[PDB]
Amino acid sequence: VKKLINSQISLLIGKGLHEFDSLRDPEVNDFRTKMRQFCEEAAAHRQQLGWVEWLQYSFPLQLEPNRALLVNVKFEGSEESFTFQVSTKDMPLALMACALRKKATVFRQQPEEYALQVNGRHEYLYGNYPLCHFQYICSCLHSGLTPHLTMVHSSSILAMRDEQSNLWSLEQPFSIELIEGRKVNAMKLVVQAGLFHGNEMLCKTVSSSEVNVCSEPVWKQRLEFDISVCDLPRMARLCFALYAVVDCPIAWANLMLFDYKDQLKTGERCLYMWPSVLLNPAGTVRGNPNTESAAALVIYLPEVAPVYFPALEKILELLREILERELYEHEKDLVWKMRHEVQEHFPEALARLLLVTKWNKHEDVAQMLYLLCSWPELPVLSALELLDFSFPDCYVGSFAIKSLRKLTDDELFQYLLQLVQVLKYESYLDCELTKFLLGRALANRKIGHFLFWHLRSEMHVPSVALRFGLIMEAYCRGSTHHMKVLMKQGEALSKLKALNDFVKVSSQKTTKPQTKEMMHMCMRQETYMEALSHLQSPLDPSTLLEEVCVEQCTFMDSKMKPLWIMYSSEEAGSAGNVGIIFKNGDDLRQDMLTLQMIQLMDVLWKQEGLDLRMTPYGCLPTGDRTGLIEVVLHSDTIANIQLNKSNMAATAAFNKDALLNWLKSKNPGEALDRAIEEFTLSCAGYCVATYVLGIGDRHSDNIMIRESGQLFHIDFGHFLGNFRVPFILTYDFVHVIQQGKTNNSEKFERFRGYCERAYTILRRHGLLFLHLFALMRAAGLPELSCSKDIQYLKDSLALGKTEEEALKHFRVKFNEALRESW
Ligand SMILES: COc1ccccc1-n1c(SCC(=O)Nc2ccc3nccnc3c2)nc2c(c1=O)CCCC2
Numbered sequence: 001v002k003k004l005i006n007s008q009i010s011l012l013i014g015k016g017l018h019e020f021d022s023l024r025d026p027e028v029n030d031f032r033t034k035m036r037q038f039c040e041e042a043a044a045h046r047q048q049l050g051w052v053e054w055l056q057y058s059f060p061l062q063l064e065p066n067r068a069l070l071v072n073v074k075f076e077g078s079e080e081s082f083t084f085q086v087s088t089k090d091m092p093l094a095l096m097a098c099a100l101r102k103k104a105t106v107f108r109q110q111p112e113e114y115a116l117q118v119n120g121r122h123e124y125l126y127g128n129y130p131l132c133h134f135q136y137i138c139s140c141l142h143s144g145l146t147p148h149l150t151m152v153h154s155s156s157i158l159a160m161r162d163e164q165s166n167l168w169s170l171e172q173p174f175s176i177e178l179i180e181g182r183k184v185n186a187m188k189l190v191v192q193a194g195l196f197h198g199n200e201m202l203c204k205t206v207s208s209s210e211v212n213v214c215s216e217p218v219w220k221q222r223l224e225f226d227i228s229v230c231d232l233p234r235m236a237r238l239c240f241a242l243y244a245v246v247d248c249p250i251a252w253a254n255l256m257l258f259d260y261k262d263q264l265k266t267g268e269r270c271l272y273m274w275p276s277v278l279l280n281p282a283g284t285v286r287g288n289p290n291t292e293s294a295a296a297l298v299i300y301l302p303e304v305a306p307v308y309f310p311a312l313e314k315i316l317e318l319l320r321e322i323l324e325r326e327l328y329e330h331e332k333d334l335v336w337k338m339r340h341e342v343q344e345h346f347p348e349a350l351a352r353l354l355l356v357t358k359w360n361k362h363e364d365v366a367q368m369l370y371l372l373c374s375w376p377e378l379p380v381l382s383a384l385e386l387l388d389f390s391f392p393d394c395y396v397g398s399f400a401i402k403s404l405r406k407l408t409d410d411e412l413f414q415y416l417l418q419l420v421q422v423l424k425y426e427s428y429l430d431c432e433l434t435k436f437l438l439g440r441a442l443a444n445r446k447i448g449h450f451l452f453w454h455l456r457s458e459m460h461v462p463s464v465a466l467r468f469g470l471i472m473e474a475y476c477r478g479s480t481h482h483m484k485v486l487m488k489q490g491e492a493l494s495k496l497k498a499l500n501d502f503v504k505v506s507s508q509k510t511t512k513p514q515t516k517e518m519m520h521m522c523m524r525q526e527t528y529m530e531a532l533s534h535l536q537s538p539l540d541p542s543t544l545l546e547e548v549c550v551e552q553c554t555f556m557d558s559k560m561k562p563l564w565i566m567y568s569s570e571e572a573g574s575a576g577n578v579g580i581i582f583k584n585g586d587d588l589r590q591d592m593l594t595l596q597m598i599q600l601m602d603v604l605w606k607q608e609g610l611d612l613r614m615t616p617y618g619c620l621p622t623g624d625r626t627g628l629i630e631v632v633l634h635s636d637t638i639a640n641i642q643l644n645k646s647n648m649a650a651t652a653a654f655n656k657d658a659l660l661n662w663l664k665s666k667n668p669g670e671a672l673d674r675a676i677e678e679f680t681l682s683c684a685g686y687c688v689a690t691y692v693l694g695i696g697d698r699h700s701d702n703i704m705i706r707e708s709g710q711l712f713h714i715d716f717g718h719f720l721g722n723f724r725v726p727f728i729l730t731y732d733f734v735h736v737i738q739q740g741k742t743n744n745s746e747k748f749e750r751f752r753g754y755c756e757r758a759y760t761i762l763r764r765h766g767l768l769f770l771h772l773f774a775l776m777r778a779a780g781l782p783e784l785s786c787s788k789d790i791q792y793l794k795d796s797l798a799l800g801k802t803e804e805e806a807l808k809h810f811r812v813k814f815n816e817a818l819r820e821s822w
Contacts (some may be wrong), residue, residue: 005480007109012487014459014623015473020470022103027260031429031470035438039478042442043672047165051154052126056113059122059542060409060446062135065606069131069140071147073099073116076156080106087139089130092116093497110627115157119148120572122542143708164481167310167361168230168318175224176238176299180217183251183273183295185244187213191297195225196237196281198392202360203227205279213244215324231362232257232264234309235392237285240271240297241278244802249276251295255286255618258309260428264270266303272296272795274463281387282778285427286464312395318366324349332356335395343371348378351385356395369395380411380820384771387422387433389778394431401432409444415602416447417596420454421778424464433469442478449541450484451475453620460624488535492545493622495531496563496582500525511640512557519563520550532565539630540619552579559587565629566697579631588621589781590627595619596715597769598689601762605685608761612754613678614687615712634707638700638732656735659705663736666707675709680737680747682711684754687728689713691813692762692796694721698728720792722783734821759810766797 010016020028023821067088073095074081082102085094096111116125118136118512124136135404178191189212194205197749198244205225211217236257243249251273258264272287272294290296320334324346327335334340335356339786342353351594353371358364373393386400407415421434441448452475455468476483499522506515522528564584569576595616598655602614618630644650644658652658653666667675690698695716702715711733737751738744762769770793776784783789793799798806 003459005121005476008487009186009473009476012476012483012490013456013469015469017473018474020466023466028466028470029262032473032754033469034430034472035434036477037436039442039474039475040434042439043166043480046159046442048756049161051157051161052115055157057125057126057443058160058445060444061127061129062123062542063129063410064133064135064138065603067141069137069147071095071149073102073149075099075103075117075151076153083146086131088137089134091130092134094129096151107292113154114151115151117152118575119150120544120546120569120576122536122544123628124152125149130761134568141204147575153731154509157756164282166480167307170229170304170307171227172304173224173353173372174227174229174232174638176224176301178219178221178223179268179298179300180215180219181242181295181297182216182622185213185248185250187246189213189217190243190245191219191243192243192278193223194239194279194281195232197235197359198390200359201279202233202236206363210245213573216647220525229304231360233359233362233365233393234258234262236393236594237281237392237427239279239281239283241276241280241293243276244295246800249278250518251275252278252280252283253297254280254283256285257301257407257492262309262431264304264309266301268300270296271610272746284424286463286466286596289462289465302309304396315369318363318545321346324352325526327356328708339367339371343375347376348382350375350382351391354391354393357690359393359512360378364653365460369393372396372399377406380404380407381768381771384415384418384768388774389417389425390773391631392425392427393534394427401436404436409447410692411443412440413447413450414596414600415595415772416450417454418772418775419774420451424778426467428485429467429470436479438471438474441475445482446541448475448482449486449536449538453538453622455622456490457621457627466700467754485536485541491531492535493538493582493626496530496565496586497626499528500555500582500584503555505564507555511555516554518778519555520551523548523550523553537578537580537618539580539628540620544572544576545578545580546570546572546576556581562629566631577633579633581629581631582626583629584626587625588619588627588629589779590719590783591626592619593622593776593779593781593784594693594719596714597693597772598686600769601685601689601692601758604761604765605758610754610757610761611681612758613681613708613710614685615706615710617712618681632704632706635704635712638703638705639707642700642732657740658730659732659736660740662705663709667709675707676736676739679705679733680751681754682709682712683690683733683737684758688755688758688762691725692726692759692793693719694725694792694796695719696721696723696725700730700732718783720783720789722789724795727813729814729817729821731821734818755814756807756810760803760807763797763799763803763806766793766799769793770799775777 002670016712020032068085069088070083071085072081084098086751093111093328096114096116100111124137132141132770137147170411190210192205195202206223206225208219208221211219236256237255238257241249241252250663253271253273254699255271273296274283274288274292281691288717319340323331335353340614341352352366353589357368384399386396386526419433419437426433437451441451452472455472458468495537499519502522503515503519506518523532532548535544535545546569547567554564556562556564560583564579564581566579598614599616602616605612615632617632621627641662642654642655642658646654650658650661663675664672690713696718703711703713705711734748738747770790773793775788802810
C-alpha cells in the first residue's frame, strides 16, 4: 500500500523515486525524511479542521479585490428550485434563511449549517460578505445572468473531508588545486574562476596556465585567491568557466564552499560541467546529471586543519536622507557608517545597506547580521526585493521569509510564479522558501494545485529536475487525495499529447474535416473518454471538466496544430460550458508571464475602483513545451469580423463599420451602449497593458472582441520591446469608441482619461512590477535576459519622473499614437 503510493508519486512527478536513492546523497536523504515529517504533520492537522475551515482549505473564497438581483437556489439531492429577489448587500446567511423558509412550506417543516455552492463548480459562498463581494455574484451582476446556487449541508461537506484522509582562526589566503579535465574543442584551453557572493565578487578572478587543447587535459596548479579563508561568508560560491583561445566558451560549473551542514569543504571534487551560452554566478551549484557525456573538472580543496561556520551566538557576539531615494564609494561609506540609524529611522532601506556591507570581511558581515536580528518586519513589497539573487545570505532570506508570512493567500497566489523561480537560486535543498511554499500549499488546495504544476512543468530541465521532484514528493506525502486528483489531470494530459501527435501527422496528408472525424474517433475510444472526462481543469481547479463534447472538438490551423477541447456539465448548465486549448510544441512561459502581469494590472486598477472589464483567461504550461490556454467563448478575432462576410448581420458599406455592426447584432437596442462602454474600458486597459509591457506586432489577427464588446489579446510572442514600441490607437477602435462618428471628442477623451488613470495607477505600483521582473530573471526566458530588459519597464512606467511629468510624457506618446491612426 505504501508501495503503491510510491509508484503513483513516481508517475505523477515524472521521475522515479529509486533515482533519489541511487544518488546515495545525505543532503537529499535528509531533505526527504525531514520534509516528509513536516508534510505529514500538516496533513494530520488538516484532517481535524472544522467543516467551514475544510471548505477554506478545499475551495478558498474567490472575492472581488442596495440593488436588486434574482438568484436561484436549490438543495443538493433534488431538482426542485426557487427564485428569490435579494439585495446585493445581503449576507450569504440571509439568502440561506430564505431558501429554508421557502423549502419548509413546500415540505411542511438553521442557516448556519449550510454553505452555498455555485452549480457545477468547486466554488462556494460563505463568510460575512455582502453578496457581490463574491466574484461570482458580482460577475453575474454584469454579464446579466442569474446566480444559480446549491444549498450544501454541513454533513455533506464533512463527508468530503472524510473521503480525503491518508573558523575565524584560518588567516591564510584561499586557494585550490586544479588537476585535470575531459572535454571537446579545436587552440589553447583556459580555466578561469572567481568567488561570488550573489553577483558581487569577493576578490579579483584568477586563471589557469594555457595548456594544449588536448585530452583529458592536466594542470595540477595552485590557484590562490585574494582573500583569507576566515573571511569566506557562509554563502560563498566558487565559480568556474572553461574556454578556448589562441574567444570561445565551452562549459561552466559552480559550488558552495560550505556544505549544507556548514562544514568547509575538502578535498578532491569532481565537477560535471554545463555547456555554455564566461563566469556564471547565478547558475546552479549542483553538477550536470549527465555524467557519461558531460565534461568534468577535478579539483582539490585543501584541508585546512574539520571546520564549521560559527553559530549565530558567535556571530551576534562579534544629506544621507537625500541620497537615500547606484551610489558613489563615498556615499556607500556614509550609509555603512549610519547603519544603526538606518535600522532606526529608515528600516525600509535595508536592501540599500546590505548592498554596501562588505561580504568579504567577516568582521563587517557580523556587524551587518547583528543589526538584522533586531530589524523590524518589512512590508511584503520590501520582502519581494530581498529575495533577489543580490541577497544570497540565508540569514537575510530567513528574514525575508519572516516578512513574507503576512501574505494573504490571494497575494501569495498572485506571486507564486515568481517565488517558484527563486527556488532555482537556492544554494541548498532544505531551505526556508521551500519550507514556506510547502506549508502554504498544504493549507490551501488552490496554492497546492498551482505549485505542483509550476514544478511539474519544468521536470524536463536537468538543472531543476532533482530539486523540483523532491518538493513534489514532499507535497504528495502531505496530500494523498490531492495526488489522485492530479494524476487524473496528468492522465488527461498524456492522452492529449497522444491525440495532438496524431493530429500533426494526419493534418499533413488530408483535409481538415477528415482529420476532425479521425480525432473524434480516437477520442471516442474507451481509454480516451475515461481519461479526458470528469476532472478538474488544471487552468483552475474549481472548474470541473465533466463530459467532453467530442462533436465540438477540433484543432487550430497553426504550425503546432493546437487542440480545441469542449466540455459541458449537466449539473453546471451554461457555465459548465468551457473549452481548453492544448498546445504542444511552443514555449508557453512567455505568455503565462504576460497574462499574469495583466492580471496584476487589473487587480491594481480594481483596488482603486477602476474596472476596465479585462479578460484574464488562464494560461498554464504543464510540461516540455506543453500547456493549456483557457478558451474564451462568444468571441472572435477583429480580423475574422473584418472578413466582413456577406450574409452575416454586420454587412457594411465601409470596413470601418464592420465591428460596430457586429456589436449591434450581438447587442440590440439599449444593450448597444453598454457594449461600446465595455469595448472602451477594455481597450483602455489592453492599450495601457501592451504599452507598458512592450508587447508589439499587434494586428487584427491577435486581438479579440467578446459579444459583450470586451476586447482582449492573444498570442504574446514578444515583450519588453523585443522586436521601443509606440502607443497604438487603431483607427477601428477609435471609430468604435466614437460611436461611429467622425468627431466625438466627448467619447474619445473619456477614453483618454481611462488610459491616463490606468497608466497613473500602475506607476504607483511600479516598484512592485520591477521586483517581480527582477525575480523572473531566474527563469531563463530569452526576452528576460538582463538589465536592458528591466530598463524597458523603468522607461515605459517613466518611473524616475514625477507624476505631472510622466503624465506629460505619456500624453505625447498617446498623441503620437492618434496621429498614426489614419
Ligand atoms: C490556430 O488559430 C488559427 C490560425 C489560423 C486560422 C484559423 C485558426 N483558428 C482560429 S483563429 C482564432 C485564434 O487564433 N485564436 C483564438 C480563438 C479563441 C480563443 N479563446 C480564448 C483564448 N484564446 C483564443 C484564441 N480559431 C479557431 C480555430 C482555428 O483553426 C478552430 C476552431 C476554434 C476557433
